[PDB]
Amino acid sequence: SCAYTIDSYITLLTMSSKKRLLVEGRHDRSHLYQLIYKFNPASKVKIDTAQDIKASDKAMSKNNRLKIETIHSKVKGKDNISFLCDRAFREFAFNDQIEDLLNSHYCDDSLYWTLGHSLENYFFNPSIIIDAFQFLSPSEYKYKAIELFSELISSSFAVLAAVSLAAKDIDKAGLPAALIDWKDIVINDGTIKLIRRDSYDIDSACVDSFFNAFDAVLPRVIASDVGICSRVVRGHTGILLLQKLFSACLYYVGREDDALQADSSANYFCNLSELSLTTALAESWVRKIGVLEDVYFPDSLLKNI
Amino acid sequence: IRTISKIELSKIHNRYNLTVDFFNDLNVIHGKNGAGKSTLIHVIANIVNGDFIRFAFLIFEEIKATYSDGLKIVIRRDKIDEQSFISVTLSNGKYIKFAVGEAMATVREIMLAMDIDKFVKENELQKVRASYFPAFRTMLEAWSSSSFYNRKASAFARELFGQFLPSINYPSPMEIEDRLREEIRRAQLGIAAYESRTFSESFVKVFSALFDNGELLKEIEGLAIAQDSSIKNGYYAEYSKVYEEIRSLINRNVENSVSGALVVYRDALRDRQDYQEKAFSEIDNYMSSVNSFLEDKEMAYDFYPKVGLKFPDGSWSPIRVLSSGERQLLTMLYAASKMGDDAIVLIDQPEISLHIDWQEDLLKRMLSQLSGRQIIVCTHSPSIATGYEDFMINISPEFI
Amino acid sequence: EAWSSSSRSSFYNRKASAFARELFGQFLPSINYPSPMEIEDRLREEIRRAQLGIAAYESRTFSESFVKVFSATGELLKEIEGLAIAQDSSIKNGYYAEYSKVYEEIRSLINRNNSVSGALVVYRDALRDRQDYQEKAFSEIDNYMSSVNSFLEDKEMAYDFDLRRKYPKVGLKFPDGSWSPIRVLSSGERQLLTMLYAASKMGDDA
Amino acid sequence: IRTISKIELSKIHNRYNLTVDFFNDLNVIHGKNGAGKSTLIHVIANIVNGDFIRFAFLIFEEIKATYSDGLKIVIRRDKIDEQSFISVTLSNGKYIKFAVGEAMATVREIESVKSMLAMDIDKFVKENELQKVRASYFPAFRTMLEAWSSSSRSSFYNRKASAFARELFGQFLPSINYPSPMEIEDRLREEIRRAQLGIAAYESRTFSESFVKVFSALFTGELLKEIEGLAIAQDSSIKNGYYAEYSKVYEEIRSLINRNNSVSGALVVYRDALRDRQDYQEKAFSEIDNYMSSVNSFLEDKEMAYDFDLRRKYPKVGLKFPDGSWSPIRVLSSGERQLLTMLYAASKMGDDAIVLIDQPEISLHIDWQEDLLKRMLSQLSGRQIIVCTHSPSIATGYEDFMINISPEFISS
Ligand SMILES: Nc1ncnc2c1ncn2[C@@H]1O[C@H](COP(=O)(O)OP(=O)(O)OP(=O)(O)O)[C@@H](O)[C@H]1O
Ligand SMILES: Nc1ncnc2c1ncn2[C@@H]1O[C@H](COP(=O)(O)OP(=O)(O)OP(=O)(O)O)[C@@H](O)[C@H]1O
Structure with missing residues (x-):
């Protein structure tokens, strides 16, 4: 392919006089571009992606975090570049209750970590999810579905975190993405209970191990604080889980009027592209910054650049 | 509109085949050395321009567009x-077959081309x-500074790199300066016509205010200060004087008609x-x-019209004193402009x-002008294609 | 000029002066009589300069009239109607030719119902x-x-502009309405044109 | 030897001055657009070549090198x-001074044989x-x-190309001295011929001396294997393409031994x-190989090599394909030709010079850009290389040799 190596990119940092920011993926670039252009629409910061930098090492080829750490280590002390990574589950304690050992943004010579599990954890404020789902909806039974969803979202974060922890315990991170479907979800009085469906495309061994991990991790997540709980949810996992949770609540509360229409709307919502959902959440998240004190963003990173 | 969506190459140079699928807005072709990037651009340019007589000089089997x-x-x-x-076979079924030697003879003389353009203009x-x-x-x-320029430069370049080379028709900087001067004259004449309109319109407007029943002076003061301090004004720039006369006569003397006349x-x-701003919209x-790229100078006009470069000391210089990179930046920004010719922009390297600080922003500043044109570039630099990796096309031809 | 047209200006005449001094010896001076293309370009430049001065004078006149009109009959309307008819039916006002409608709106505004007479005057x-400024600007060209047109019989040299194309077209105008460039003139007409421009105020002092 | 170390500019185009400090091995010059990179390279190329008559076409005040x-x-x-x-004033006090109109007149006479000014310049640069x-x-x-040159040039003969390039890019532009691939091919043929002639002289000397030492010393299982390996390696080399019968002579000698002290000396x-x-074959072909x-570390589907045939006597130099075909060096693409010229200029075969490469x-x-400077420096010529580049893939790994250019604009 036509891309720079690590050394060529480091030399480019020496040659370029722009203010630069290095993130892992392109989606992070698009979201951060919206964030920067909100505060300064004429800002000249250029955002590069470590995904588009070739690495000679096979292991470092697809390890974005290792690329960022390697580059930051080799140019430690430069002034024109800042780095942002995803905290993932680092500095988190799973000693029967979720505990955050940092509870703030990490900083080490222009190297920063997201406050949550990843960049998408800033979208997990309930108002942003509401606004985004309301704007991007089939517009059939939106108001009642949003009202029900607003009831479910308080307790659903514990379920979502438990799902993410169950995924990371068996290292099958992408397993809940294809395993759990919105139909398995049941809409209770603010809570949900993903019944173990008898029929699944995936092998029963993975399903059984997943539910064993989920059952063994769920009381621990329940005992944790809600605010801490919303930050440990995996960024990519959470988006899909919310999409299914909204499909389930939409079909649950809209089937009485028209079961077929509710099913079509719910399936339509489940068939919405992840990129559409993330972009709508990103725009809503950008809009809520400065309006609500409960909406976070890497203020230190913006201040540094 | 109409945009290129597919190019297939079969046995071109009797050597390789290559099928490429395009986007309708931006395509960033890249590949190894000798991969046929430049030949692909030549084929696309010859097909889109309708200059099928170039294809007598290309060894191939079948080209589908x-x-x-x-x-x-x-x-x-x-x-x-x-x-x-x-x-040449269209989708309508109409076709034309012509001999290579006749095309070569018409090239050496410079009839068949008349038939070709009749076929093109028909379809x-x-x-x-x-x-x-x-x-x-x-x-x-x-070379050219030491469409007639297009014709002579096309002839010289086809003399060097073969006759299959398409017609060179990118805007030269001299053509850019001339067209900028022409746009300034058109904007001046439009402003003159607008003044004659608003002259006769405002006479009956004040005449209308004869029988109809503070901060306005400050707003008129701001407008007169802005207009007097406007570079688009070079003549009759004494609005401050008549504003002072008006406010003096107001302070000397209250009718609603006076307020209506102020309105x-x-x-x-x-x-x-507003018309002065909208007339110079494209030029500005x-x-x-352009001025978002140049660091210690600024291309600007100041009126006979003068188009040049202001330096921070206030001195003026022509466009010929610019470097190579700055001239290429000027041509590539003019091609994507709205005042540029509506075409498919094919840029080679x-x-x-x-x-690199200009390479990162070239595609962003070309696409942000909303020209709506399709841009296809062949590049070796990853900084050109950064931020637009969704449009990257990697070509790997099948060598035979 | 036939030799030149089958292959020049006051300032750019090197090939013509070289050919003339080749033919008639090197004591022969430089060929300084102008070409009709130079006359056409000079006419276009003078027309553009006249339009620019007209626009500036219009801005100044609007400013002066608005200053004059504030803090303040039938025959005035008849004279204004005649002026509007003259300006509407003038070739120089091709950029704006709606004065009689303006006069009629003014007359209807007066007619539906002193201080108005000052605005009228x-x-x-x-x-x-x-x-007058139009005549002042176009005095040399007119x-x-x-x-020139005192000699031409079946054509007249004239100017025409448009709001479609902003390029004022100067050339031969026939009474049947056809427009032709100045190159369609014969030898004698071109000689008369060059000798009258050489004696004109538009040409350089020489 | 002598390498450049400092260039001091004063009011180039009456607006900027510049001062650049160089290294003696490699100088990677980068800067903004219009910084004066090409102008700096033109100034250095005019100064080192001694073409001071170029400096009448530049607006400046004072230039110190x-x-x-x-x-x-x-x-x-x-x-x-x-x-x-x-x-022009040197450091030893010797100086010359001429008029700009005189220099323009000399350039105009060149456009039509040395002038008086050209003879004076040549005398001044030769005696100093x-x-x-x-x-x-x-x-x-x-x-x-x-x-353009291949449609109508060498380092010594580039008059037409220098005139055309000075017409296009102004008269301050230096003469175009960089070697053409035809010049590279001719130089390679001459080096092969010189190495072969030295090999022949070595053959005569070693034959006479070996006969003397054999005849004087006249009055083992491992040795035969070692001689067998040496004769096999001699027979399997391209340099022995005129005579390749060493294994036959070894087998004849071994059969002579096998059919029936002093002979051990003849064997050793x-x-x-x-x-x-x-070893003399490796030494004589050291620079060429x-x-x-x-060069062949870059080319993918071909490799440059030489071939000798006993019937002809012209040594063939060119490209070799895996299917056995041979093509000359003009069938290369543009990038391969650029690699060829920029690697010959950094070679030991090239003339002692200061290699000025622009872009x-x-x-x-991008794969060739990461290795060009490494392969230029790996030949150990000892040159001083000054490159004006915009590519970070060229300059990677050499950030100690990178020089930033920032001219100072003076107001007026
Ligand atoms: N007659 C010919 N004319 C042009 N190219 C030819 C011809 N015969 C063979 N080729 C090959 O066709 C290929 C196309 O060359 P071209 O210059 O278009 O390459 P590219 O992919 O644009 O890359 P680059 O710009 O690096 O050369 C080359 O590999 C060239 O060797
Ligand atoms: N004749 C001239 N008169 C005035 N200024 C000039 C003249 N020629 C060049 N300049 C200016 O002086 C500088 C010359 O820089 P130079 O030609 O070396 O640029 P460069 O290194 O090739 O630039 P780039 O990176 O844009 O290719 C530029 O700022 C240019 O505008």
Whole structure:
């Protein structure tokens, strides 16, 4: 392919006089571009992606975090570049209750970590999810579905975190993405209970191990604080889980009027592209910054650049 | 509109085959050395311009071009009676087969081309043209300064790199300066016509205010200060004086008709300011796009019209004193402008003589002008294609 | 000129002067009589300069009239109607030719219902000033075209502009309405054109 | 030797001055657009070549050049009584001074044989030893320039190309001295011929000396295997393409031994003669094989090599394909030709010069840009290389040799 190596990119940092920011993926670039252009629409910061930098090492080829750490280590002390990574589950304690050992943004010579599990954890404020789902909806039974969803979202974060922890315990991170479907979800009085469906495309061994991990991790997540709980949810996992949770609540509360229409709307919502959902959440998240004190963003990173 | 969507190459140079699928807005072709990037650009430019007589000089078997609207052109190079014949077949079924030797004879003389353009004009194959930026822009610009320029430079370049090379038709900087002067004259004449309109309109407006029943002076003061301090004004720039006379006569003397006349005068001032801004909209957008790149100078106008570069000391210099990279930046920004010719912009190696801080922003500033044109670039630099990796096309030809 | 046209200006005449001194010895001076293309370019430049001065004078006149009109009959309307008819039916006002409608709107505004007479006389004075400035701007060109058209029989040298194309077209105008460039003139007409421009005020002092 | 060390500019185009400090091995010059990179390279190329008559076409005030050995050349442009004058003053006090109109007249006479001014300039630069080091100048427009040259040039004969390039890019542009691939091919053929002739002289000397040592010393299982390996390696080399019968002679000698002290000396001098001939073959072909190994490290589907046939006597130099075909060097693409010229200029076969390359990333893929400077420096020529580049893939790994250019604008 036509891309720079690590050394060529480091030399480019020496040659370029722009203010630069290095993130892992392109989606992070698009979201951060919206964030920067909100505060300064004429800002000249250029955002590069470590995904588009070739690495000679096979292991470092697809390890974005290792690329960022390697580059930051080799140019430690430069002034024109800042780095942002995803905290993932680092500095988190799973000693029967979720505990955050940092509870703030990490900083080490222009190297920063997201406050949550990843960049998408800033979208997990309930108002942003509401606004985004309301704007991007089939517009059939939106108001009642949003009202029900607003009831479910308080307790659903514990379920979502438990799902993410169950995924990371068996290292099958992408397993809940294809395993759990919105139909398995049941809409209770603010809570949900993903019944173990008898029929699944995936092998029963993975399903059984997943539910064993989920059952063994769920009381621990329940005992944790809600605010801490919303930050440990995996960024990519959470988006899909919310999409299914909204499909389930939409079909649950809209089937009485028209079961077929509710099913079509719910399936339509489940068939919405992840990129559409993330972009709508990103725009809503950008809009809520400065309006609500409960909406976070890497203020230190913006201040540094 | 109509955009290129597919190009298939079969046995070109008797050597390789290559099928490429395009986007309708931006395509960033990249590949290894000798992969046929430049040959692909030449084929696309010759097909889109309708200059099928170039294809007598290309050794191939079959070239298929598909547009966005479904129009399909298939070009074949057949061999009958130890003579090569180029066959062009449309989707309508109309076709034309012509001999290679006759095309070569018409090239050496410079009849068949008249038949070709009749076939093209009959079938509307020249609905959209193509602006071709070669990889040798700098020395060609230096050669031509020492459409007639297009014709002579095309002849010289086809003399050097073969006759299959398409017609060089990118805007030279001298053409850019001349067209900028022409746009300034048109904007001046439009402003003159607007003044004659608002002159006769405001007479009956004040005449209308005869029988109709503070901060306005400050707003008129601001408008007169802005208009007097406007570079688009060079003549009759004494609005401050008449504003002072008006406020003196006001302070000397209250009728609602006076306030209505103030409203009419304020509307006339701001409306002339709005037309003065909208007349120079394209020129200011192009120079704002250019001046976002240049560091210690600024391309600007100041009126006979003068178009040049202001330096921070206030001195003026012509466009000829610019470097190679700055001239290439000017040409590539003019091609994507709204005042540029509507075509398909084909640029071969846009990273030539450009610093990386300009290469990162070239595609962003070209697409942000909303020209709506399709841009296809062939590059070796990853900083040209950064931020637009969704449009990257990697070509790996099948060598035979 | 036939040798030149089958292959020049006051300032760029090197090949013509070289050919003339080749033919008639090197004592022969430089060929300084102008070409009709130079005359055409000079006419276009003078027309553009006249339009620019007209626009500046219109801005100044609007400013002066608005200053004059504030803090303040039938025959005035008849004179204004005649001025509007003259300016509407003038070739120089091709960029704006709607004065009689303006006059009719003014007359209807007066007619539906002193201090109005002052506005009337300053409007008439503004129209007179515009008409005089048009004649002042076009005096040299109108004098030159009056001198030229006193010789041409089946054509007249004339100018025409548009709001479609902003390029004022100058060339031969026939009474049937056809437009032709200046190169369609014969030898004698071109000689008369060059000798009248050489004696004109539009040409350089020489 | 002598390498450049400092260039001091004063009011180039009456607006900016510049001062650049160089290294003696590699100088990677980068800067903004319009910084004065190409102008700096033109100034250095004009100073080192001693073409001071170029400096009448530049608007400046004073130009000082310091070399590594301490020789300083100061060029000053003055305006006396509206007449402009160029005065060149050296560090030893020797100086010359001429008029700009005189220089323009000399250039016009060249456009039509040396002038008086050209003879004076040549006398001044010859008696002061101002032309110790040459300067190979690679322009940015070389890709179209060689296509223009190949449609109608050498380092010593580039008059037409220099005139055309000075017409296009102004008269300050230095002469286009960079080697054409035809010049590279001719130089390779001459080096192969010189190595073969030295090999023949070595054959005669080693034959006579070996006969003497054999006859004087006249009055083992491992040795035969070692001699067998040496004869097999001698027979399996391209350099022995005129005579390749060493294994047959070894088998005949072994059969002579096998059919029936002093003979041991003959065996060991045979092994020593084969070793000495093989080492002299490597030594005589050292630069050519090193250069071809540097070039063939880049080319993918072909490799440059030489071939000798006993029928003809012209040594064939060119491209070799895996299917056995041979093609000359003009069938290369543009990027491969750029690699060929830029690697020959950094080779030991090239002339002693200061290699000035403007924009080396022209028509090069990103894989070749990362290795060009490494393969130029790996030949150990000892040159001083000055490159003006915009590519970070060229300059990677050499951030100690990177020089930033920031000219100072002076207001007025
Ligand atoms: N007659 C010919 N004319 C042009 N190219 C030819 C011809 N015969 C063979 N080729 C090959 O066709 C290929 C196309 O060359 P071209 O210059 O278009 O390459 P590219 O992919 O644009 O890359 P680059 O700009 O690096 O050369 C090359 O590999 C060239 O060797
Ligand atoms: N004749 C001239 N008169 C005035 N200024 C000039 C003249 N020629 C060049 N300049 C200016 O002086 C500088 C010359 O820089 P130079 O030609 O070396 O640029 P460069 O290194 O090739 O630039 P780039 O990176 O844009 O290719 C530029 O700022 C240019 O505008």
